[PDB]
Amino acid sequence: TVSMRDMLKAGVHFGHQTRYWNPKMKPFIFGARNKVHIINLEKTVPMFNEALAELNKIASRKGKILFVGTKRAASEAVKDAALSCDQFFVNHRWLGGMLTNWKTVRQSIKRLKDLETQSQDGTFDKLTKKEALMRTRELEKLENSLGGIKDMGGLPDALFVIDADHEHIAIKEANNLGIPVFAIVDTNSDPDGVDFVIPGNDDAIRAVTLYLGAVAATVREGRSQ
Amino acid sequence: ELQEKLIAVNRVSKTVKGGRIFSFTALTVVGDGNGRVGFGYGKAREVPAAIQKAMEKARRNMINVALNNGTLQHPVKGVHTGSRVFMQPASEGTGIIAGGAMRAVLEVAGVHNVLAKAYGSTNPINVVRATIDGLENMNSPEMVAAKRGKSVEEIL
Amino acid sequence: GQKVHPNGIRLGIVKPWNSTWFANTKEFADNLDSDFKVRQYLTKELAKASVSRIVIERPAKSIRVTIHTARPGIVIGKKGEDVEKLRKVVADIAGVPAQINIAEVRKPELDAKLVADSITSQLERRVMFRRAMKRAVQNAMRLGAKGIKVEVSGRLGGAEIARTEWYREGRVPLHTLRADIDYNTSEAHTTYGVIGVKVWIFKGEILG
RNA sequence: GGCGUAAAGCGCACGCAGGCGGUUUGUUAAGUCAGAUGUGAAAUCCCCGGGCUCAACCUGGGAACUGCAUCUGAUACUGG
RNA sequence: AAGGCGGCCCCCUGGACGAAGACUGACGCUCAGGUGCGAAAGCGUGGGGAGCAAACAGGAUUAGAUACCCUGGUAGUCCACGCCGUAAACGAUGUCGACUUGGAGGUUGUGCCCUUGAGGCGUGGCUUCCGGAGCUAACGCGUUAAGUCGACCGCCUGGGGA
RNA sequence: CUGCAUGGCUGUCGUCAGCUCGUGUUGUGAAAUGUUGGGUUAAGUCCCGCAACGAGCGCAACCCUUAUCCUUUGUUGCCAG
RNA sequence: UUCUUCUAAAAAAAA
């Protein structure tokens, strides 16, 4: 469904500097030109198709999937991608315990929900201005961190992680709860916890928009089914 | 449905500026009288709260042990930090020949005839960890047959 | 003992007085003494009946005392039988004409005095102190209280050295003056000495 | 069963006696393994029975005595 | 090999490492007893003695000060030949060999590409720090293992006595 | 008589800014995290960051008094015309 | 710059 030429234009093949590699990612590394690793696209493509197929399969059963990207190079791209494909995202800081300690995160999302109803339609003004600013700031930060998942209802059925190393906490929580992980793993990340490894660059804007469009396309198609 | 056993309850302590703070720890094991068993270690300021936390932790993170009709399937040995443990299958009606924490975890795990022995330190937490470690890596005839690619009759 | 009495510190903010009358200094002391005698007699008589508060007020040289209790059927029995019996002896003790009204206490599990008497009776009949504390806290929290803290002190479980145990669920803000913390104590005369019970109940902040 | 810190690596090295030894072929059969024979007293231990009302006890037959010697054979490993 | 070795020059001399071959053909590894080497202090004989400095003397501090601090100062420290054979003689990790992800350096050879400047790509020896699996009571060790194995030797069985 | 068998009450560190819990995670475990870090405050007060997310007892506010003005009320209080 | 020492009896929990 995705070729090799588009990826090469995007910059997927680029990895990190040689001093920083991680040895568990050796099968997917082609070589190292100009002291930077290159992923072999002839290897990333045949397993990316299986990942997209599995994601379509889990989407067609009306399953909730959760997108995790917080690098600030993908924050807006994951937010608009998830909204366009009617899914969930975490674009700001992943607060620890978001999946395992869901019993309290449900209270926090409930706090966010009643607070936004109070603000826009409840019209909870006409009292002391400093308290109104404090509630506004509290709602602002709560929304900023938990807006994407505020109506999820329960724990999701799969996770899509943009950076396997930087978002190690989310992958660990998912493995702890037996939820499948699909991840874009660079040459410096650890792919053991990931159930569906996807080699490739996780730093370029072109590459990240390409991945997000592809996953949005397949999840939309599966939902349509 | 599941059977729950309390193994050992002791009082741990912690010294602060005010003085000593005494807390309680509870080691329990739960299981379904068959291949499912799991241990829980809970800690709180009171023994009911401690045993409750232990039971909730025990009901999760369980493992499947491929046991025989009423016994183990071969002599297996396990180790976890201070307890070299060894256990082997026994004939019908010999009971659970085990000591301390081992007896409780085996009984709840559904085995009925087993000869066991604990070497090294006999600390309850370590021996119950080592016991399920050995049980976890205990091979079954179907598993080893499928693994090596031969029939169960070829391996006997 | 370090903490000031919660009802005392709130006597002019959110809590009312248990005796609301006026008297000059000539008859203030004997009026107070008369109030003490009637309170002592009533507390002694109605031990079985769960009496929560004895409000006293004397308009125009006639005492009128309103008992707040959770079991009015027990305190009245057959219609108009022992209420008059209490009224006459109270009028005789005070030496002034009396009148006794009775206020029912809705939800007795959220009343500090009644919980204290219940815990103290259970202690006197030798139940586990931890069990009594847990039962009281769970019942209170289930009926809709914003918070309760109970404390029991002295020779618990027939021990040799006394200790203090306490539980607290919810909010119990003792520094907030507008919080209507219902506080009361009691004591159990067990065979190993006396055990003291204290209970704070936070019902929700009062605005105004 | 251990020897960094709980008791435990000689301060370091050379080296006789001693322990062990890469890889291929042939020969031998000492170590090793299989079979047979002789022997390993009786009782005792174990198995299946029998006799004292049962049991302890006594007793028939078998197994066991894991060993040693000789004869015949096997030659993969160790030794010549 | 360990103890250890620091200006420069000469004489005699041991070990280690690299690149191409050629050669002998298991000749190998470890080692009780044995032998040799073995910091500093100390001993004997004969020299030498500037500085430093056990003992000792004097002056301070102190309740006391047979010490710490100050001024002197003798064996000793130095040379030649013997003796002693002990140290937290330590990497608190015996020697030899095989296998098991990696990163940044230090030091010393050596092959190729245009040394298109002090460039790039390999391949050996020694050595420092971080870290994966694994091991460990933990701290940590982690291709220079305390990981997985094999050969040999020395040593331990509660603390004090010792 | 026993405050060294106790209840209730009080001093004290000290009106110092601290002390904990639920769930999750790390460690075989006692424990840790939260509660630490960069600023700031009288303050664990607040923000940012962060395997922590929240909550409670405490840090402040709500209470009394004092400081300014306005409305109601002017005697036993006051005297501008 | 100097600044030593406090003998000899405690109690703490067990769903």
Coordinates of N, CA and C in Angstrom, one line a residue, chain B residues 10-151:
Chain B
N10 N 4.1 -10.9 59.0 CA 5.1 -10.4 59.9 C 5.0 -8.8 59.9
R11 N 5.6 -8.2 61.0 CA 5.6 -6.8 61.2 C 6.9 -6.2 60.8
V12 N 7.0 -5.4 59.7 CA 8.2 -4.7 59.4 C 8.1 -3.3 60.0
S13 N 9.3 -2.7 60.0 CA 9.3 -1.4 60.7 C 10.0 -0.3 59.8
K14 N 9.9 0.9 60.3 CA 10.5 2.0 59.6 C 10.7 3.1 60.6
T15 N 11.9 3.7 60.7 CA 12.3 4.7 61.7 C 12.2 6.0 61.0
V16 N 11.5 7.0 61.7 CA 11.4 8.3 61.2 C 11.8 9.2 62.4
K17 N 11.7 10.6 62.2 CA 12.1 11.6 63.2 C 11.3 11.4 64.5
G18 N 10.0 11.1 64.3 CA 9.1 11.0 65.4 C 9.4 9.7 66.2
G19 N 9.9 8.7 65.6 CA 10.1 7.4 66.2 C 9.9 6.3 65.2
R20 N 9.5 5.1 65.7 CA 9.3 4.0 64.8 C 7.9 3.8 64.3
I21 N 7.8 3.5 63.0 CA 6.5 3.3 62.3 C 6.4 1.8 62.0
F22 N 5.5 1.1 62.6 CA 5.3 -0.3 62.4 C 4.3 -0.6 61.3
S23 N 4.7 -1.3 60.2 CA 3.8 -1.7 59.2 C 3.7 -3.2 59.1
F24 N 2.7 -3.7 58.4 CA 2.5 -5.1 58.2 C 2.6 -5.5 56.7
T25 N 3.1 -6.7 56.5 CA 3.2 -7.2 55.1 C 2.5 -8.6 55.1
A26 N 1.8 -8.9 54.0 CA 1.1 -10.1 53.9 C 1.4 -10.9 52.6
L27 N 1.9 -12.1 52.7 CA 2.2 -13.0 51.6 C 1.1 -14.0 51.5
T28 N 0.3 -13.9 50.4 CA -0.8 -14.9 50.1 C -0.6 -15.5 48.7
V29 N -1.3 -16.6 48.5 CA -1.2 -17.3 47.2 C -2.7 -17.7 46.8
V30 N -3.0 -17.6 45.6 CA -4.4 -17.9 45.1 C -4.3 -18.8 43.9
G31 N -5.3 -19.6 43.6 CA -5.2 -20.5 42.5 C -6.6 -21.2 42.3
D32 N -6.7 -21.9 41.2 CA -8.0 -22.5 40.8 C -8.0 -24.0 41.0
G33 N -7.1 -24.6 41.8 CA -7.1 -26.0 42.0 C -6.6 -26.8 40.8
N34 N -6.0 -26.1 39.9 CA -5.5 -26.6 38.6 C -4.3 -25.8 38.2
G35 N -3.9 -25.7 37.0 CA -2.7 -25.1 36.5 C -2.6 -23.6 36.7
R36 N -3.6 -22.9 37.3 CA -3.5 -21.4 37.5 C -3.2 -21.2 39.0
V37 N -2.1 -20.4 39.2 CA -1.7 -20.1 40.6 C -1.0 -18.7 40.5
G38 N -1.0 -18.0 41.5 CA -0.3 -16.7 41.6 C -0.1 -16.2 43.0
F39 N 1.0 -15.5 43.3 CA 1.3 -15.1 44.6 C 1.2 -13.6 44.7
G40 N 0.7 -13.1 45.9 CA 0.6 -11.7 46.1 C 1.3 -11.2 47.4
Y41 N 1.9 -10.1 47.3 CA 2.6 -9.5 48.5 C 2.1 -8.1 48.7
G42 N 1.3 -7.9 49.8 CA 0.7 -6.6 50.0 C 1.3 -6.0 51.3
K43 N 1.2 -4.7 51.4 CA 1.8 -4.0 52.6 C 0.9 -2.9 53.0
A44 N 0.5 -2.8 54.3 CA -0.3 -1.7 54.8 C 0.0 -1.5 56.3
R45 N -0.7 -0.6 56.9 CA -0.6 -0.3 58.3 C -1.4 -1.3 59.2
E46 N -2.4 -1.9 58.6 CA -3.2 -2.9 59.3 C -3.2 -4.2 58.5
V47 N -3.3 -5.3 59.3 CA -3.3 -6.7 58.7 C -4.5 -7.0 57.8
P48 N -5.8 -6.5 58.1 CA -6.9 -6.8 57.1 C -6.6 -6.1 55.7
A49 N -6.2 -4.8 55.8 CA -5.9 -4.1 54.5 C -4.7 -4.7 53.8
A50 N -3.7 -5.2 54.6 CA -2.5 -5.9 54.0 C -2.9 -7.2 53.2
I51 N -3.8 -8.0 53.9 CA -4.2 -9.3 53.3 C -5.1 -9.0 52.1
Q52 N -5.9 -7.9 52.1 CA -6.7 -7.6 51.0 C -5.9 -7.2 49.8
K53 N -4.9 -6.3 50.0 CA -4.0 -5.9 48.9 C -3.2 -7.1 48.3
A54 N -2.8 -8.0 49.2 CA -2.1 -9.2 48.8 C -3.0 -10.1 47.9
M55 N -4.3 -10.2 48.3 CA -5.2 -11.0 47.5 C -5.5 -10.4 46.1
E56 N -5.6 -9.1 46.0 CA -5.8 -8.4 44.7 C -4.5 -8.5 43.8
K57 N -3.3 -8.4 44.4 CA -2.1 -8.6 43.7 C -1.9 -10.1 43.2
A58 N -2.4 -11.0 44.1 CA -2.3 -12.4 43.8 C -3.2 -12.8 42.6
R59 N -4.5 -12.3 42.6 CA -5.4 -12.7 41.5 C -5.0 -12.2 40.1
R60 N -4.1 -11.2 40.0 CA -3.5 -10.8 38.8 C -2.1 -11.5 38.8
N61 N -1.4 -11.3 37.6 CA -0.1 -11.8 37.3 C 0.1 -13.3 37.7
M62 N -0.9 -14.1 37.2 CA -0.9 -15.6 37.4 C -0.2 -16.2 36.2
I63 N 0.2 -17.5 36.3 CA 0.8 -18.3 35.3 C 0.2 -19.6 35.2
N64 N 0.3 -20.2 34.0 CA -0.2 -21.6 33.7 C 0.8 -22.6 33.9
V65 N 0.7 -23.6 34.8 CA 1.6 -24.6 35.0 C 1.0 -25.9 34.4
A66 N 1.8 -26.5 33.5 CA 1.4 -27.7 32.8 C 1.6 -28.9 33.6
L67 N 0.6 -29.2 34.5 CA 0.8 -30.3 35.5 C 0.1 -31.6 34.9
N68 N 0.5 -32.7 35.5 CA 0.0 -34.0 35.2 C -1.4 -34.3 35.8
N69 N -1.9 -35.5 35.9 CA -3.2 -35.8 36.4 C -3.4 -35.3 37.8
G70 N -2.4 -35.6 38.7 CA -2.5 -35.0 40.0 C -1.1 -34.6 40.6
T71 N -0.1 -34.7 39.7 CA 1.3 -34.5 40.1 C 2.0 -33.6 39.1
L72 N 3.4 -33.5 39.3 CA 4.2 -32.8 38.4 C 4.5 -33.7 37.2
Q73 N 5.3 -33.2 36.2 CA 5.6 -34.1 35.1 C 7.1 -34.6 35.0
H74 N 8.0 -34.0 35.7 CA 9.4 -34.5 35.8 C 10.1 -33.7 37.0
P75 N 11.2 -34.3 37.5 CA 11.9 -33.5 38.6 C 12.5 -32.2 38.1
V76 N 12.1 -31.1 38.8 CA 12.5 -29.8 38.3 C 13.1 -29.0 39.5
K77 N 14.1 -28.2 39.3 CA 14.7 -27.4 40.3 C 14.7 -25.9 39.9
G78 N 14.3 -25.1 40.9 CA 14.3 -23.6 40.8 C 15.1 -22.8 41.8
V79 N 15.4 -21.6 41.5 CA 16.2 -20.8 42.4 C 15.7 -19.3 42.3
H80 N 15.6 -18.6 43.4 CA 15.3 -17.2 43.5 C 15.9 -16.6 44.7
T81 N 17.2 -16.1 44.6 CA 17.9 -15.2 45.5 C 18.4 -15.9 46.8
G82 N 17.8 -17.0 47.3 CA 18.4 -17.7 48.5 C 17.9 -19.1 48.7
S83 N 17.1 -19.6 47.8 CA 16.4 -20.9 48.1 C 16.5 -21.7 46.8
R84 N 17.6 -22.6 46.9 CA 17.6 -23.6 45.8 C 16.5 -24.6 46.1
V85 N 15.6 -24.8 45.3 CA 14.5 -25.7 45.6 C 14.4 -26.8 44.5
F86 N 14.1 -28.0 45.0 CA 14.0 -29.2 44.1 C 12.7 -29.9 44.4
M87 N 12.0 -30.4 43.3 CA 10.8 -31.1 43.6 C 10.6 -32.2 42.5
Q88 N 10.0 -33.3 42.8 CA 9.8 -34.3 41.8 C 8.5 -35.0 42.0
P89 N 7.9 -35.6 41.0 CA 6.6 -36.3 41.1 C 6.6 -37.5 42.0
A90 N 5.4 -37.8 42.7 CA 5.4 -38.9 43.5 C 4.2 -39.8 43.1
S91 N 4.1 -41.0 43.6 CA 3.0 -41.9 43.3 C 1.7 -41.4 44.0
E92 N 0.6 -42.1 43.7 CA -0.7 -41.7 44.3 C -0.8 -41.9 45.8
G93 N -1.3 -40.9 46.5 CA -1.6 -41.0 47.9 C -0.4 -40.7 48.9
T94 N 0.7 -40.2 48.4 CA 1.8 -39.9 49.3 C 1.8 -38.5 49.8
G95 N 0.9 -37.6 49.4 CA 0.8 -36.3 49.9 C 1.8 -35.3 49.3
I96 N 1.7 -34.1 49.9 CA 2.6 -33.0 49.6 C 3.7 -33.0 50.7
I97 N 4.9 -33.5 50.3 CA 6.0 -33.5 51.2 C 6.8 -32.2 50.9
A98 N 6.4 -31.1 51.6 CA 7.0 -29.8 51.5 C 6.8 -29.0 52.8
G99 N 7.7 -28.0 52.9 CA 7.9 -27.2 54.1 C 7.7 -25.7 54.0
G100 N 6.9 -25.2 54.9 CA 6.7 -23.7 54.9 C 5.8 -23.2 53.8
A101 N 6.3 -22.2 53.1 CA 5.5 -21.6 52.0 C 5.2 -22.5 50.8
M102 N 6.2 -23.4 50.6 CA 6.1 -24.4 49.5 C 4.8 -25.3 49.6
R103 N 4.5 -25.7 50.8 CA 3.3 -26.5 51.0 C 2.0 -25.8 50.6
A104 N 1.9 -24.5 51.0 CA 0.7 -23.7 50.7 C 0.6 -23.5 49.2
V105 N 1.7 -23.1 48.5 CA 1.7 -22.8 47.1 C 1.4 -24.0 46.2
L106 N 2.0 -25.2 46.6 CA 1.7 -26.4 45.9 C 0.3 -26.9 46.0
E107 N -0.3 -26.8 47.3 CA -1.6 -27.2 47.6 C -2.6 -26.4 46.8
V108 N -2.4 -25.1 46.8 CA -3.3 -24.2 46.1 C -3.1 -24.4 44.6
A109 N -1.9 -24.8 44.1 CA -1.6 -25.0 42.7 C -2.2 -26.3 42.2
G110 N -2.8 -27.2 43.0 CA -3.4 -28.4 42.6 C -2.7 -29.7 42.5
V111 N -1.4 -29.6 42.8 CA -0.6 -30.9 42.9 C -1.0 -31.6 44.2
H112 N -0.9 -32.9 44.2 CA -1.3 -33.6 45.4 C -0.2 -34.6 45.8
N113 N 0.7 -35.0 45.0 CA 1.7 -36.0 45.4 C 3.0 -35.5 44.9
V114 N 3.9 -35.0 45.8 CA 5.1 -34.4 45.4 C 6.1 -34.5 46.5
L115 N 7.4 -34.9 46.1 CA 8.5 -34.9 47.1 C 9.3 -33.6 46.8
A116 N 9.4 -32.8 47.8 CA 10.1 -31.5 47.7 C 11.2 -31.3 48.7
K117 N 12.2 -30.4 48.4 CA 13.2 -30.1 49.4 C 13.8 -28.7 49.1
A118 N 13.9 -27.9 50.2 CA 14.4 -26.5 50.1 C 15.8 -26.4 50.6
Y119 N 16.8 -26.0 49.8 CA 18.1 -25.8 50.2 C 18.4 -24.3 50.3
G120 N 19.5 -23.9 50.8 CA 19.9 -22.5 51.1 C 19.0 -21.9 52.1
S121 N 18.6 -20.7 52.0 CA 17.8 -20.0 53.0 C 16.3 -20.4 52.7
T122 N 15.6 -20.6 53.7 CA 14.2 -21.0 53.6 C 13.2 -19.9 53.8
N123 N 13.6 -18.7 53.4 CA 12.8 -17.5 53.5 C 11.5 -17.6 52.7
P124 N 10.3 -17.4 53.3 CA 9.0 -17.7 52.6 C 8.8 -17.1 51.2
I125 N 9.1 -15.8 51.1 CA 8.9 -15.0 49.9 C 9.8 -15.6 48.8
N126 N 11.1 -15.8 49.1 CA 12.1 -16.3 48.1 C 11.7 -17.7 47.7
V127 N 11.3 -18.6 48.6 CA 11.0 -20.0 48.2 C 9.7 -20.0 47.4
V128 N 8.7 -19.2 47.7 CA 7.4 -19.1 46.9 C 7.7 -18.5 45.5
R129 N 8.7 -17.6 45.4 CA 9.1 -17.1 44.1 C 9.9 -18.2 43.3
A130 N 10.8 -18.9 43.9 CA 11.6 -19.9 43.3 C 10.7 -21.1 42.8
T131 N 9.7 -21.4 43.6 CA 8.8 -22.6 43.4 C 8.0 -22.3 42.1
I132 N 7.4 -21.2 42.0 CA 6.7 -20.8 40.7 C 7.6 -20.6 39.6
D133 N 8.9 -20.3 39.8 CA 9.9 -20.1 38.7 C 10.1 -21.5 38.1
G134 N 10.4 -22.5 39.0 CA 10.6 -23.9 38.5 C 9.3 -24.4 37.8
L135 N 8.1 -24.1 38.4 CA 6.9 -24.6 37.8 C 6.7 -23.9 36.5
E136 N 7.1 -22.6 36.3 CA 6.9 -21.9 35.1 C 7.7 -22.6 34.0
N137 N 9.0 -22.9 34.3 CA 9.9 -23.4 33.3 C 9.8 -25.0 33.3
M138 N 8.8 -25.6 33.8 CA 8.6 -27.0 33.8 C 8.0 -27.4 32.4
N139 N 8.8 -28.2 31.7 CA 8.3 -28.6 30.3 C 7.2 -29.7 30.4
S140 N 6.4 -29.7 29.4 CA 5.3 -30.7 29.3 C 5.6 -31.6 28.1
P141 N 5.2 -32.9 28.1 CA 5.4 -33.8 26.9 C 4.9 -33.2 25.6
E142 N 3.8 -32.6 25.5 CA 3.3 -32.0 24.3 C 4.1 -30.8 23.9
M143 N 4.5 -30.0 24.8 CA 5.4 -28.8 24.5 C 6.7 -29.2 24.0
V144 N 7.4 -30.2 24.7 CA 8.7 -30.6 24.2 C 8.6 -31.3 22.9
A145 N 7.5 -32.1 22.7 CA 7.3 -32.8 21.4 C 7.1 -31.8 20.2
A146 N 6.2 -30.8 20.4 CA 6.0 -29.8 19.4 C 7.3 -29.0 19.2
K147 N 8.0 -28.8 20.2 CA 9.2 -28.0 20.2 C 10.3 -28.7 19.3
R148 N 10.6 -29.9 19.6 CA 11.6 -30.7 18.9 C 11.1 -31.2 17.6
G149 N 9.8 -31.1 17.3 CA 9.2 -31.6 16.1 C 9.0 -33.1 16.0
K150 N 8.7 -33.8 17.1 CA 8.5 -35.2 17.0 C 7.2 -35.6 17.7
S151 N 6.7 -36.8 17.5 CA 5.5 -37.2 18.1 C 5.7 -37.6 19.6

